[PDB]
Amino acid sequence: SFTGQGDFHLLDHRGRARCKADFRGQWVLMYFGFTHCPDICPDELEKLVQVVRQLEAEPGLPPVQPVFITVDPERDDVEAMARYVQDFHPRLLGLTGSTKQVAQASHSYRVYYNAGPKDEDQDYIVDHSIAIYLLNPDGLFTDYYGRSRSAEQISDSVRRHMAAFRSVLS
Ligand SMILES: [Cu+]
């Protein structure tokens, strides 16, 4: 008795907070990042935006909506997300939160990011190991992508992930 649908809750880049249930009826691309990457995110977000724009051009392919998610709150803001979305394009979506969100999400859904020690000198932040995930139109996941790729492998992989997950109404 009760559901309780394997939920989640994050802040919207305009000062609200969105639940798992709103995103139903879409394909959604989940990206784990932070508002201060030097030279990985400004490749990959533009690289993925070119794949999203290919799927605006090519008829019958899935409407892949991106979300960018902050992995640590000690350097972010909802107003920083609001810029990080819009100065790329208003088709972006920015999501943020705090410890008892991101920790209980990670306890429910185990995934890699490296919290490091330090003592005296002192570079290092957190490793964000360039993986992304496909969330789908009932609030379930399909599979992963990333590690090292570029648009020509992505559009064919999104076509193959589509041909695996399927429609129905066939
Ligand atoms: Cu990055």
Side-chain angles (χ1 to χ4, degrees), residues 37 40-41 128:
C37 183
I40 304 299
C41 298
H128 103 105

mmCIF file with all atom_site columns, all heavy atoms in Angstrom, residues 37 40-41 128, ligand 1:
data_model
loop_
_atom_site.group_PDB
_atom_site.id
_atom_site.type_symbol
_atom_site.label_atom_id
_atom_site.label_alt_id
_atom_site.label_comp_id
_atom_site.label_asym_id
_atom_site.label_entity_id
_atom_site.label_seq_id
_atom_site.pdbx_PDB_ins_code
_atom_site.Cartn_x
_atom_site.Cartn_y
_atom_site.Cartn_z
_atom_site.occupancy
_atom_site.B_iso_or_equiv
_atom_site.pdbx_formal_charge
_atom_site.auth_seq_id
_atom_site.auth_comp_id
_atom_site.auth_asym_id
_atom_site.auth_atom_id
_atom_site.pdbx_PDB_model_num
ATOM   1  N  N   . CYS A 1 37  ? 33.195 24.266 -14.308 1.00 0.00 ? 37  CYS A N   1
ATOM   2  C  CA  . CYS A 1 37  ? 34.076 23.447 -15.117 1.00 0.00 ? 37  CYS A CA  1
ATOM   3  C  C   . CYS A 1 37  ? 34.826 24.340 -16.125 1.00 0.00 ? 37  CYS A C   1
ATOM   4  O  O   . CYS A 1 37  ? 34.228 25.257 -16.713 1.00 0.00 ? 37  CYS A O   1
ATOM   5  C  CB  . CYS A 1 37  ? 33.277 22.367 -15.842 1.00 0.00 ? 37  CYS A CB  1
ATOM   6  S  SG  . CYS A 1 37  ? 34.316 21.251 -16.821 1.00 0.00 ? 37  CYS A SG  1
ATOM   7  N  N   . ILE A 1 40  ? 35.683 20.849 -19.949 1.00 0.00 ? 40  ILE A N   1
ATOM   8  C  CA  . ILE A 1 40  ? 34.938 19.621 -20.308 1.00 0.00 ? 40  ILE A CA  1
ATOM   9  C  C   . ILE A 1 40  ? 33.474 19.960 -20.619 1.00 0.00 ? 40  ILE A C   1
ATOM   10 O  O   . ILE A 1 40  ? 33.040 19.761 -21.755 1.00 0.00 ? 40  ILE A O   1
ATOM   11 C  CB  . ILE A 1 40  ? 35.071 18.541 -19.206 1.00 0.00 ? 40  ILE A CB  1
ATOM   12 C  CG1 . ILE A 1 40  ? 36.538 18.183 -18.869 1.00 0.00 ? 40  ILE A CG1 1
ATOM   13 C  CG2 . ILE A 1 40  ? 34.280 17.273 -19.583 1.00 0.00 ? 40  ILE A CG2 1
ATOM   14 C  CD1 . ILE A 1 40  ? 37.366 17.606 -20.027 1.00 0.00 ? 40  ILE A CD1 1
ATOM   15 N  N   . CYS A 1 41  ? 32.730 20.532 -19.666 1.00 0.00 ? 41  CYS A N   1
ATOM   16 C  CA  . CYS A 1 41  ? 31.354 20.983 -19.877 1.00 0.00 ? 41  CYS A CA  1
ATOM   17 C  C   . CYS A 1 41  ? 31.163 21.935 -21.084 1.00 0.00 ? 41  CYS A C   1
ATOM   18 O  O   . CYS A 1 41  ? 30.196 21.729 -21.819 1.00 0.00 ? 41  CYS A O   1
ATOM   19 C  CB  . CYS A 1 41  ? 30.828 21.606 -18.578 1.00 0.00 ? 41  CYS A CB  1
ATOM   20 S  SG  . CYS A 1 41  ? 30.748 20.465 -17.172 1.00 0.00 ? 41  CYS A SG  1
ATOM   21 N  N   . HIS A 1 128 ? 34.229 14.562 -11.709 1.00 0.00 ? 128 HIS A N   1
ATOM   22 C  CA  . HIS A 1 128 ? 32.964 14.309 -12.405 1.00 0.00 ? 128 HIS A CA  1
ATOM   23 C  C   . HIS A 1 128 ? 33.246 13.519 -13.703 1.00 0.00 ? 128 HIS A C   1
ATOM   24 O  O   . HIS A 1 128 ? 33.601 14.079 -14.736 1.00 0.00 ? 128 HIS A O   1
ATOM   25 C  CB  . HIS A 1 128 ? 32.149 15.624 -12.542 1.00 0.00 ? 128 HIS A CB  1
ATOM   26 C  CG  . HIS A 1 128 ? 32.103 16.360 -13.872 1.00 0.00 ? 128 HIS A CG  1
ATOM   27 N  ND1 . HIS A 1 128 ? 31.022 16.363 -14.706 1.00 0.00 ? 128 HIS A ND1 1
ATOM   28 C  CD2 . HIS A 1 128 ? 33.040 17.233 -14.363 1.00 0.00 ? 128 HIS A CD2 1
ATOM   29 C  CE1 . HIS A 1 128 ? 31.249 17.217 -15.705 1.00 0.00 ? 128 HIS A CE1 1
ATOM   30 N  NE2 . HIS A 1 128 ? 32.468 17.758 -15.534 1.00 0.00 ? 128 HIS A NE2 1
HETATM 31 CU CU  . CU  B 2 .   ? 32.867 19.305 -16.989 1.00 0.00 ? 1   CU  B CU  1
#
